[PDB]
């Protein structure tokens, strides 16, 4: 069911014959990706070869997790799965897993630096991020690492959400909510809503909201916008070392966001004020956000589906490496293409 070796991305790509013209793309950071033409379907698609899939139990488990998700994620605004394959002929030869996804070819990371976005752009973009968010949270999944470089966008403006495997090293946390950063409180799905806020801020401005260096510098910026905590919320904080840093701080109240983002569609400055909020339990949710005014052009209750959550088929059933490399293997052959 036949393949063909090729030299791509410091690897060795044996892949089914339906996918021609493999032209490498992306950093090659976490799995490498190649654009392609898919003969069997006439469409253009992406093909990523996971890296070091079964090197550790950390990695092995991480791969089975990631596969399990993508098989169950079906949605216009979350990255859907087009095929998954493997050149091995039986568990022994198993070593590599390749994903095939629909090609998009730009992410907000890069768009925000080459294009000045309009309000109408931002309405529809953040609308889509919220649509898939709602669906994802439903499955009871927390994305956990939502940033502009995780959001594939093409030119006819469709957006899709990427890259879950935190649902290691990270070079910056400009988009993580302070809850999960210093682990005081513990966290809602609203952690994700915090990121969405930062992203929207950046679209409207072209600048990154909280470009911080160390966890303090990052924390000192967050607070510079949303004001220091009140005794209300400080009560809800976990640490001892954490509470004291706060009090040790020039206590400042939240400056009104309409004073900060001068020249923003007021309806949006308002939605900002409800996403970038320090208390988890009181941060707006994905669902509630859609029904917000900003998204008047696009809100449609009757077309904002949810997912039927899936299980923990193993997940934490702690196993050796040769273990996962088999559960994963099964998930791979078990795959059935989505509707042609």
């Amino acid at each position: 069911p036949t393949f063909y070796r090729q030299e791509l991305n410091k690897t060795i790509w044996e892949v089914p014959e339906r996918y021609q013209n493999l032209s490498p793309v992306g950093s090659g950071a976490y799995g490498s990706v190649c654009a392609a033409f898919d003969t069997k379907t006439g469409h253009r698609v992406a093909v990523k070869k996971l890296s070091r899939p079964f090197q550790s139990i950390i990695h092995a488990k991480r791969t089975y997790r990631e596969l399990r998700l993508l098989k169950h994620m079906k949605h216009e605004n979350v990255i859907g799965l087009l095929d998954v394959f493997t050149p091995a002929r039986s568990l022994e030869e198993f070593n590599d897993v390749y994903l095939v996804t629909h090609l998009m070819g730009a992410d907000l990371n890069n768009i925000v630096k080459c294009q000045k976005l309009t309000d109408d752009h931002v309405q529809f973009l953040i609308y889509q991020i919220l649509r898939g968010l709602k669906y994802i949270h439903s499955a009871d999944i927390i994305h956990r690492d939502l940033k502009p470089s995780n959001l594939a966008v093409n030119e006819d403006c469709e957006l899709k959400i990427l890259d879950f495997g935190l649902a290691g090293y990270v070079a910056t946390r400009w988009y993580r909510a302070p809850e999960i950063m210093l682990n005081w409180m513990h966290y809602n799905q609203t952690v994700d809503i915090w990121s969405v806020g930062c992203i929207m801020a950046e679209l409207l401005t072209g600048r990154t909201l909280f470009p911080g260096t160390d966890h303090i510098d990052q924390l000192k910026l967050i607070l510079r916008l949303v004001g220091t905590p009140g005794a209300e919320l400080l009560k809800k904080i976990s640490s001892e070392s954490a509470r004291n840093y706060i009090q040790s701080l020039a206590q400042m109240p939240k400056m009104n966001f309409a004073n900060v983002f001068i020249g923003a569609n007021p309806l949006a400055v308002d939605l900002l004020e409800k996403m970038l909020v320090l208390d988890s339990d009181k941060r707006i949710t994905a669902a509630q956000a859609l029904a917000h005014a900003y998204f008047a052009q696009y809100h449609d209750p009757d077309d904002e589906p949810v997912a039927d959550p899936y299980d923990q088929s193993f997940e934490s059933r702690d196993l050796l490496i040769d273990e996962w490399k088999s559960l994963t293997y099964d998930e791979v052959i078990s795959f059935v293409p989505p509707p042609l």
Binding site: A29, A106, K113, C114, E155, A171, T172, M181, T213
Partner: protein, 332 residues
């Protein structure tokens, strides 16, 4: 400037089957010059305009001592596909960090780090001065010219390099409004600024053996939160630290430029540099696979720090059409 030869490369070089490794577009093979029997390495790219620019720029760069030298460039058909075969100085030594890894350990001293960093900064100083940004300076692209002590450190792989504007930058002012200014788009500001960030991150690993990156798991420290965790950073001068910090400045325009770098005393005066040993060699030993994660994230971070000029622009919103967009507009 460069003339690409049109003959069969086999006319000139015995193209061996033995492999030097694997790259992006290329499987690199060892080769020999027929006449002179010197040993070289052959790298292939598919022949399009992207490939010819990497080719051009890396040509111009070849006159620099610390950049891997391109010897010849052929255009042949290889198995019926147009290709640029690129012939290159052989690079024996291996990655930079694999070397420091392996030691007597004769100890790894801070002045060594300074030379190693003066090396890379020469490579980068050369490029910027004739207006080229590499934009992919990381560990797997810093290789040695042999396994001997007299080995030179070389910078390779121009897949991402590009020419940019030499443009003295906004020395961003001390007093500023509370409110956020309009962004003036100007992508060319991420070009050179990306090699300076690189310079910082490597220099940091060099002096401790672990990245300045954060960790996923939250706040045996093997990740500087962009801080300098004792003991490793206990001995390292505080002047060095100020350096790492001006290089890792979050802001592209505000961040250190290569000539400001080459003037910095810890580089320039590479030689009266404090000679203290460093934990680098030992830590690098520590966990092997953890290095592998350092490399994966450095690569992903570089990927966001620099501009993909090969990306689509979004239509003006009204000029756009798609399924959801047509459902909603319908009902609106």
């Amino acid at each position: 400037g460069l003339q690409i030869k049109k003959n069969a490369i086999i006319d000139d070089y015995k193209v061996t089957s033995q492999v030097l490794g694997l790259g992006i577009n290329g499987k690199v093979l060892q080769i020999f010059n027929k006449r002179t029997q010197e040993k070289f390495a052959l790298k292939m790219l598919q022949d399009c305009p992207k490939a010819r620019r990497e080719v051009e720029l890396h040509w111009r760069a070849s006159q620099c001592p610390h950049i891997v030298r391109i010897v010849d460039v052929y255009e042949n058909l290889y198995a019926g596909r147009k290709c640029l075969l690129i012939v290159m100085e052989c690079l024996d030594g291996g990655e930079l960090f694999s070397r420091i890894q392996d030691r007597g350990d004769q100890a790894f001293t801070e002045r060594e780090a300074s030379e190693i960093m003066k090396s890379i900064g020469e490579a980068i100083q050369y490029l910027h001065s004739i207006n080229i940004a590499h934009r992919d300076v990381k560990p797997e692209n810093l290789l040695y010219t042999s396994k001997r002590p007299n080995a030179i450190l070389k910078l390779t792989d121009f897949g991402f390099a590009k020419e940019t504007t030499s443009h003295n930058s906004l020395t961003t002012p001390c007093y500023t409004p509370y409110y956020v200014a309009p962004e003036v788009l100007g992508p060319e500001k991420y070009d050179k600024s990306c090699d300076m960030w690189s310079l910082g991150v490597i220099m940091y690993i060099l002096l401790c053996g672990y990245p300045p990156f954060y960790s996923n798991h939250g706040l045996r420290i093997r990740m500087g939160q962009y801080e300098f965790p004792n003991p490793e950073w206990s001995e390292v001068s505080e002047e060095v630290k100020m350096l790492i910090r001006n290089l890792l400045k979050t802001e592209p325009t505000q961040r250190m430029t290569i000539t400001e770098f080459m003037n910095h005393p810890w580089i320039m005066q590479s030689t009266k540099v404090p000679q203290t040993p460093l934990h680098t060699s030992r830590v690098l030993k520590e966990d092997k696979e953890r290095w592998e994660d350092v490399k994966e994230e450095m690569t992903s971070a570089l990927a966001t720090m620099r501009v993909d000029y090969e990306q689509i622009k979004i239509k003006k919103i009204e000029d756009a059409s798609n399924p959801l967009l047509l459902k909603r507009r319908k009902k609106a």
